[model samples]
Target: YDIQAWKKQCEELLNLIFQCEDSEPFRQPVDLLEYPDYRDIIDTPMDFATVRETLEAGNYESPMELCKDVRLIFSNSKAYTPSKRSRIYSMSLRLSAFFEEHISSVLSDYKSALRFHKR
Candidate 1:
């Protein structure tokens, strides 16, 4: 994706997310690392930048690292739905697994495997 386009998409999403503005408890850090679900993050848009930055920086080591940071905020937050929590948790879990499998497959087969599927 074009870096500028990608930044624009995030900015647009961030705008819609700030619908309910509330005074945050923390002045700095906003603690986006703690939240995961879009709606929950929407409720606390101040923190969205932190989480987005974490994702943009590719900081997740394993799914567990992502899971720990995610479940922390939602568990403490009042606005989160159980379904939203589960959905993001699963997505993070699956993303890690997919990354590992795809990277391993690329290493093992190189061009032959790349030829197996039409991109």
Candidate 2:
């Protein structure tokens, strides 16, 4: 019974990433024309909508699994940003650090909630 609530409970992490600054670039898959060589370098593209869709579909076995895809979006953005000084590059830095901090907080809350299991 409690397991059913975890998906909704953990969905908040996705919301935080959406509200972060410079998250526009990741809200959808990178455009081919905008980034012609994106396919050449990026191993697998990821985005916010896809993450939420996956969450809704329940493809993930646990909240941590869903968080992995979100983290991949962050890491992939960092790799694509070639310009060492471009504006998007800075956004990647901000998002990367921001997610890392907040992810742990969510993990902590989830772990603590484990103790409240129903009898």
Candidate 3:
């Protein structure tokens, strides 16, 4: 299950989420014309609170799932404010890289361990 790797990925994803949340666009009032999906999942104080609580509890489905949720929030913010696309793009890339790195390492290590056990 690569528990350690999964936890590391989750933490990195959470940091990426925090960056997106603190972005100027996210702090701005929703403009439906700019962001048709402004009222999506993480759109309110309560929603933000819920996310934080979940994060603190470390109760997530999987690393991929966590990445998906963070991406959705960042994507929405980028769509709502075109001017912040560059920043959002950078943050998205960071999250992607972390996910890829962690997954690759976990799988490679698992495969190696499995091979050792086979002998």
lDDT of 3 by residue, 33-98 (tens): 865665663354222334445656877654444545545555554454446546755654555455
Clashing residue pairs in all predictions, respectively, total 0, 0, 0
TM-score of each: 0.27, 0.78, 0.42
Model 3: lowest-lDDT 10 consecutive positions: 41-50
> What lDDT would each prediction earn against the true structure?
0.40, 0.76, 0.50
Sliding window of 10 residues with minimal summed lDDT for model 2: 1-10
Which candidate comes out best when scored by lDDT? 2
Alpha-carbon runs more than 4 Å astray in model 3: 12-52, 82-119
Candidate with more favorable, higher TM-score: 1 or 2: 2
In model 3, the Cα lDDT at residue 95 comes to 50
Q: Which portions of model 2 show Cα errors greater than 4 Å? A: 1-6, 109-119
Deviating ranges (above 4 Å) for candidate 1: 1-48, 78-119
